[PDB]
A and B are shown apart, each in its own frame.
Chain A
């Protein structure tokens, strides 16, 4: 029915990436993030910003020749947090209600058959 592209949302903490590409991936179409739509460092991840970046992305998305899109949501991953950032579901919620018909969305956070020593040491990191 529509013209399909790929949404692909990387939502870590301290920032959230939204950017749509051609269904193959090789050629992209507009990006914009949460760090872009506010200036305060501390407020780089928050849903409020992602919503704004969802808004910008939706504009250019339909500005070229895309009408619909499948999303591939994703946390940091690797030897890092493994859990979805705040402004990723909020970045998808603001992208869902924008006309761009969605379809089939899986998680793609890189998960290892574990290893490479995590950072932090025996004491560990964030507190």
Chain B
């Protein structure tokens, strides 16, 4: 004899300033009561929204983003970056038969000393005139590709403060410099960041979080 819905208070979630749409979704909490409140619950939640819902454009159907809530201000709770994933359906289609797959990754620091591990995947493409279907590189090929990818990724992560990497990933410049330094080794197709995770963030610093929001 209670009903949970008629007790909680609806809340509004706002995305980071560097995004196509600030508005994201609404959530249910629990009245900020004396002893156990609505303030504590909202801070640790995260939200997975496909950036195509978050950028509008569909040339972005895959690629999912983690938005974590850090601060709150009355029916208005802000968010920052917490990671990026791909979509499972898109990844399955990319793994075609008779072709080499290549992955590489590095754990690396930024300016505003978040620590992250970013990913990268690419596949050997057929030479547009090639009689042989397999088109497999040569391990020696693979070794070199990963070392260059690894090279390029560490350069981007150290240069990017944290938010800048965000601004770096969205237009996928990374994806292309790869292809550029790569095409001298072996063809390759797709080539994406694929997944990035956060594992060590610095300290709150309420000032820095406010700067991202507009």
Contacts and interface: CB of A to CB of B under 8 A. Distances in A.
Direct contact of A and B (CB under 8 A): yes
Interface of A: 3-4, 22-24, 26-27, 29, 63-65, 103-104, 106-108
B89 A23 contact: no
Contacts of B163: none
Interface stretch (B46-54, B124-132, B205-213): B46-54
Interface in B1-56: 5, 8, 10, 13, 24-29, 41, 45-47, 49-50, 53
Interface residues of B, number: 20
Interface of B: 5, 8, 10, 13, 24-29, 41, 45-47, 49-50, 53, 87-89
Given A24-B47, A26-B45, A3 B26 contact: yes
Contacts of B25: 4, 22-24
A24 B27 contact: yes
Contacts, number: 44
Task: Tell me what chain B mostly uses at the interface: helix, strand, loop, or mixed.
Answer: strand
Contacts of A65: 5, 10, 26, 28
Most chain B beta-carbon neighbours within 10 Å: one of A3, A23, A24, A103: A24
A23 B47 contact: yes
A107 B28 contact: no
A22 B87 contact: no
A107 B27 contact: no
Shortest 7 CB-CB distances between A and B: which pairs? A23-B25, A64-B5, A24-B45, A27-B28, A22-B27, A24-B47, A26-B45
Contact of B8 (A4, A27, A107): A27
A106 B45 contact: no
A42 B6 CA distance: 37
Select the residue from A3, A26, A108 with max chain B CB neighbours within 10 A.
A26
Given A23-B47, A24-B45, A24-B46, A106 B27 contact: no
Contacts of B28: 22, 27, 29, 64-65
Contacts of B29: 27
Contact of A107 (B26, B46, B49, B89): B89
Contacts of B5: 29, 63-65
Given A27-B29, A65-B28, 7 more contacts: A24-B25, A24-B45, A24-B47, A27-B28, A29-B28, A65-B26, A106-B88
B87 A26 contact: no
Given A26-B27, A65-B10, A106 B47 contact: no
A106 B93 CA distance: 13
A106 B61 CA distance: 11
22 contacts: A22-B25, A23-B24, A23-B26, A23-B47, A23-B49, A24-B27, A24-B45, A24-B47, A26-B41, A27-B27, A27-B28, A27-B29, A29-B28, A64-B5, A64-B28, A65-B26, A103-B53, A104-B50, A104-B53, A106-B87, A106-B89, A107-B89
